[PDB]
Amino acid sequence: IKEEHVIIQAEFYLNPDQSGEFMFDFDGDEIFHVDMAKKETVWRLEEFGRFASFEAQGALANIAVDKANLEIMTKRSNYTPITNVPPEVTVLTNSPVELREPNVLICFIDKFTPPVVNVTWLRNGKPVTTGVSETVFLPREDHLFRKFHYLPFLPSTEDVYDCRVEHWGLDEPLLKHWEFDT
Amino acid sequence: DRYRLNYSLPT
Amino acid sequence: DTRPRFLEQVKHECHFFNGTERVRFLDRYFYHQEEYVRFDSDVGEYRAVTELGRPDAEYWNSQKDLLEQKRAAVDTYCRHNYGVGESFTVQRRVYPEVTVYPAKTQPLQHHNLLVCSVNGFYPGSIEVRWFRNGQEEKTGVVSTGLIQNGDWTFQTLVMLETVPRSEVYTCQVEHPSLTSPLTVEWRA
Ligand SMILES: *[C@@H]1O[C@H](CO)[C@@H](O)[C@H](O)[C@H]1NC(C)=O
Ligand SMILES: *[C@@H]1O[C@H](CO)[C@@H](O)[C@H](O)[C@H]1NC(C)=O
C-alpha cells in the first residue's frame, strides 16, 4: 500500500517564551514527546511506552542546543522576528453523535505559527475543563504547526459548545461552534 | 527496545 | 503580549522505501519557517538552503567526526528506530467503523443527504464508494476527505444526495486492514 514511511524527530525552541518541544512523528502522528518541565517521555498512546523506551535526557540537551543556536540565528538575521500566521480551526466529534452516548469533541487547530495558542472550551458560554486533554504542537511540511484539543461530553439537544482559540495572528478570538445537528 | 536520538548540532 | 517571537526548528527525518531497503536521512534546520541548512544523506555533507545557512554548512562540514556520524545515521539512527517501533507503527492496522445514516440536517429539496461515516481506522489510506442498487454513484457525492483525529485514528465522512423513496444504497469501504471490501447497505 504505502511504499513510503517517514519518522521525524522534530524540535523547536521559542524566544522569549523559553518554550521548547521535542517529539517523534511517524507519518504525521506523534509517537512521543518529552515534557520539558517534568523531564519525562510522554508516549502519545500509553501502549507505545510498553514496547519501546527513550531516554529523555538527550532530548533536553538537544533543546538546549536549539536554544543556543536560536540566539545566534536571531542576531545573524539582524533580529528578524517570525510572522504571525493565524490558525484555521475545525470542530468535530470522534464518532457519529448519539443522545446520551459518550463522545469526544475534537478542536483541530491547523497551519499556524508561532507555536503558542490559548484554547478554551465553552459549554453554553461557560468554560469547561472536566476531562479536557490536548496534544503538543505537531510539525507540518510547510513548517507551520497543528494541534488537537479534546473534550469528552454527553451529547444532548440542550447543550451547545464552542472552541475558543486565541492567537497573535488573529484579530478577534476565534470561536468555532458545534451543536447536536452539526 | 530503545529509540535513538539524533544530535542537533551546535553552530 | 505582542513581543516579537523568534523560533528555531530542527527536523531529523528518516525516509523509508520498501521497509529499510532504501533510507534517506535529512538533518534540517529552520529559522521561523525558513530552512537554512540541511544534511542530505544522498549528498553526504551539509549544504546551505538559504544565505542564512552558509556559516553552518562550512563549519559543520569542517569536522570529519561530525560528518562521519551523520553519514552513519541511515543505519545507526533511521534503520534502528524503524525496527524499534515497526510492530506498532508500520504494522498497526485498525478496522474502520462504518455507519450509514440520513443526515440530521436535510438541506435540499427532492434530494436527501445520506451519510457514510467511516471512523477510527488506521492507517490513513482508504477508499469509500457509494452504490445505488448496484450502480456506482459519482454524482451528488460530497466527502470531507481524510481527517486525522490526532490519536492514531482517522475518519472520513462521505455524503450522498439520494432520491428518498421506499431502493438500496451501499457504502463500500476498502482499507489495508481488510481482506475484503466492507459494505453497509441502507434501504429507505
Ligand atoms: C487564556 O484565556 C483565558 C480566557 O478564556 C484566560 O483566563 C487565560 O489566562 C489565558 N491564558 C493565556 C496563557 O493566555
Ligand atoms: C524490497 O525488499 C526485499 C527484501 O530486501 C527485496 O527482496 C525486494 O527485491 C525489494 N523490492 C523492491 C521493489 O525494491
* Strand composition percent of chain C: 35-45%
Shape of chain C: elongated
Query: What's the main sheet of chain A like?
Result: 5 strands, antiparallel
Return the structural class of chain A.
Answer: mainly beta
| Multimeric status of the protein | heterotrimer
Glycosylation sites (chain C): 18
Disulfide bonds (chain C): 14-78, 116-171
Membrane topology (chain C): Single-pass type I membrane protein
Domain Ig-like (chain C): 96-183
Name the descriptors.
heterotrimer; A: 182 residues; mainly beta; Class II Histocompatibility Antigen, M Beta Chain, Chain B, domain 1; Immunoglobulin-like; 5-stranded antiparallel sheet; 2 helices; globular; B: little secondary structure; 0% helix; binds 2-acetamido-2-deoxy-beta-D-glucopyranose; immune system
Explain how this protein is built.
With about 180 residues, chain A is mainly β. Chain A folds into 2 domains: about 80 residues, Class II Histocompatibility Antigen, M Beta Chain, Chain B, domain 1, CATH 3.10.320.10; about 100 residues, Sandwich (Immunoglobulin-like), CATH 2.60.40.10. Helices cover about 15% and strands about 45% of the residues of chain A. Chain A contains 2 helices and 13 strands. Chain A is globular and about 55 Å long. The two termini of chain A are about 35 Å apart. Chain B is low in regular secondary structure and about 10 residues long. In chain B, about 0% of the residues lie in helices and about 0% in strands. Chain B is rod-shaped and about 30 Å long. The termini of chain B are far apart. In chain C, strands 5, 6, 9, 10 and 11 form a 5-stranded antiparallel β-sheet that branches. A 4-stranded antiparallel β-sheet of chain C has the order 1-2-3-4. Chain C has a 4-stranded antiparallel β-sheet with strand order 8-7-12-13, with no helix packed on it. In chain C, about 15% of the residues lie in helices and about 45% in strands. In chain C, a hairpin with a 2-residue loop joins strand 2 and strand 3. Chain C is α+β, with helices and mostly antiparallel strands. Strand 1 of chain A pairs antiparallel with strand 1 of chain C. The site of one 2-acetamido-2-deoxy-beta-D-glucopyranose (NAG) has 2 residues of chain C, from loops. Chain A: It is found in: Cell membrane; Endoplasmic reticulum membrane; Early endosome membrane; Late endosome membrane. Chain A: It is a single-pass type I membrane protein. Chain A: It comes from Homo sapiens. Chain A: Keywords: Adaptive immunity, Cell membrane, Cytoplasmic vesicle, Disulfide bond, Endoplasmic reticulum, Endosome, Glycoprotein, Host-virus interaction, Immunity, Isopeptide bond, Lysosome, Membrane, MHC II, Signal, Transmembrane, Transmembrane helix, Ubl conjugation. Chain A: GO terms for molecular function: MHC class II protein complex binding; MHC class II receptor activity; peptide antigen binding; polysaccharide binding; T cell receptor binding.
